[PDB]
């Protein structure tokens, strides 16, 4: 039980202060499921995960299991993976193709739209089947990516994303042919709070430019040289979304950092030649120098996170205040050469897998933070979100929106402020952009 007044006093974006109880409180988590996950747009995957009629993927919206399924009319429907009879999981495999869905408990049959079509012994024991199908969700697509929302009142995907879209287009709108997803999706379990992981991809380049990824960079450079040949990137920018708590960060004029992570063949694909020149033409309407933007990180609040330069993308599944699941996958340009696709695949595995040289260290920090927060004193004083306070502005030649320096917590402050807003305001009448 939390009064709106007490919620608002957990995030101070003016002073740059965070109450560490937001990562650990059980009661606050139960509210997050209702007030954040129960009405935000959540990423479920890519249009190419379900390319044929009847193709499906079993995923999650918060702690609610759901079913992505392509229909006959080429649309994607998302419904709760729960039978209304007695709660049994309708779809029991991770992915595949279905001609229908049947409940294993009492045999309630559903078509691929989630509509209840057959109930055993209905004539004999029964009630309207049209009212007892699983709960449906609003489905919306942004340039390949599939999002879902339960709330009928919630803003449409476009309005929800707002001025964060140009920054998503850096990864997605590079070809008229669109992006495709590389097969396979990595699932692992980290015992930390989702806000740590979502904030890092939203606002934390600071960790990659300091100590966290010293060994990761060491893994990416030639055998004969060490970190004393590795220069620190200090040029770049950060973006805070006008509304929604989305955020992005990137390096400018720093091709060396892309090379260390993604190798020479990706670097050249991203920065030179026809595909990079085509991307620059297509993305020109935003004014951004896309060819000079590297090491980009982004979070679409709440739990949709990606690294546009690396084509890495992930969903964070909440599992209590002290646990998440990470579901990661990778994209490529549909028409990109086979060798470029392969390099994006290889390096994503090397870097951002559960055992990736970068990822290992990210998760290592989060584990020890969550453990600390078990203590009384560890939650007694506020955390410092004071980085880059009052230094951002909307007047920038190259980058649209509220833009500041690459090492800053403006997007972080925006993320938590929006989190606070969604948690303290019950109606979309006050919350809407």
């Amino acid at each position: 039980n939390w009064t709106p007044e007490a919620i608002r006093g957990l995030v101070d974006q003016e002073k740059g202060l965070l109450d560490p109880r937001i990562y650990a409180d059980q009661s606050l988590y139960e509210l997050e499921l209702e007030r954040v996950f129960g009405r935000s747009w959540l990423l479920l995957g890519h249009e190419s995960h379900v390319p044929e009629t009847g193709d499906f993927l079993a995923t999650y919206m918060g702690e609610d299991p759901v079913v992505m399924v392509r229909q006959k009319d080429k649309s994607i429907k998302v419904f709760l993976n729960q039978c209304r009879h007695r709660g049994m999981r309708i779809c029991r495999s991770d992915a595949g193709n279905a001609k229908a869905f049947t409940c294993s408990y009492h045999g309630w049959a559903y078509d691929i739209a989630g509509k209840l079509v057959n109930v055993p012994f209905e004539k004999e024991a029964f009630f309207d089947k049209a009212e007892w199908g699983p709960l449906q969700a609003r489905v919306a697509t942004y340039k390949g990516l599939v999002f879902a929302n339960w709330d009928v009142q919630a803003p449409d995907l476009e309005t929800y994303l707002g001025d964060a879209r140009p920054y998503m287009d850096v990864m997605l709108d590079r070809t008229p042919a669109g992006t495709v997803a590389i097969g396979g999706m990595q699932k692992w379990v980290i015992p930390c709070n989702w806000k740590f992981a979502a904030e890092q991809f939203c606002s934390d380049m600071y960790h990659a430019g300091t100590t966290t990824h010293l060994s990761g960079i060491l893994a990416g450079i030639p055998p004969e040289m060490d970190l004393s040949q590795a220069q620190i990137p200090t040029k770049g920018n950060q973006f805070r979304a006008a509304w929604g708590g989305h955020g992005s960060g990137w390096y400018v004029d720093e091709p060396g950092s892309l090379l260390a992570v993604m190798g020479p063949k990706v670097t050249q694909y991203w920065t030179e030649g026809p595909a990079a020149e085509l991307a620059e033409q297509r993305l020109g309407h935003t004014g951004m120098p896309v060819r000079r933007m590297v090491g980009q990180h982004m979070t679409i609040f709440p739990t949709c996170s990606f690294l546009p330069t690396f084509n890495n993308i992930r969903i964070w599944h909440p599992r209590g205040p002290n646990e998440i699941e990470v579901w990661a996958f990778t994209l490529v340009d549909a028409d990109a050469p086979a060798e470029i696709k392969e390099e994006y695949r290889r390096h994503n595995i090397r870097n951002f897998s559960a055992g990736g040289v970068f990822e290992q260290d990210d998760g290592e920090n989060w584990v020890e933070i969550q453990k600390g927060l078990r203590g009384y004193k560890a939650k007694s004083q506020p955390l410092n979100a004071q980085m880059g306070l009052g230094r951002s502005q909307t007047g920038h030649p190259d980058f649209p929106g509220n833009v500041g320096y690459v090492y800053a917590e403006e997007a972080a402050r925006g993320m938590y402020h929006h989190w606070m807003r969604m948690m303290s305001e019950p109606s979309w009448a006050t919350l809407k952009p």
Binding site: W188, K341, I349, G363
Partner: protein, 180 residues
Amino acid sequence: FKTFEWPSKAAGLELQNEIEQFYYREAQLLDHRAYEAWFALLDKDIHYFMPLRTNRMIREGELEYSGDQDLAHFDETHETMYGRIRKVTSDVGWAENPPSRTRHLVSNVIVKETATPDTFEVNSAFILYRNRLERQVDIFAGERRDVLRRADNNLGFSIAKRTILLDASTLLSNNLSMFF
């Protein structure tokens, strides 16, 4: 992946012991964090592979493991494996500094001779116990399918190919900072 095609005639007693002792020595290198010594066992043409496993209905069991062009937990070459060795031996490699405490129990060693002399295809099962920091315990179980070569080295053999079939879909562990 289907059952390992064991040869009709079993490997000789000398050979069965040679392969077994190779794995016991190899596990000793890993459990005592001799990452430099272990890396020297890998040939330059090494493919170190560990596919994803998905839950599939019996009717779709041929889609269980990920493929050549899909994501994997590991899909490594000699060059990339060395980077990983360079990270784990690093003092600024946080995920393994302080290091974990690993135990590779190795059994189920089935040896198959190939069409190339001194080259062998070997199946083995394992349980990897991993203990980290204060209370973290991660238990892995799986299967190794290696192509091993007779080598003029310390352990008697070198590794040309390794596929690790891990008994997991979602990793219960927060990372895979250990080698298999």
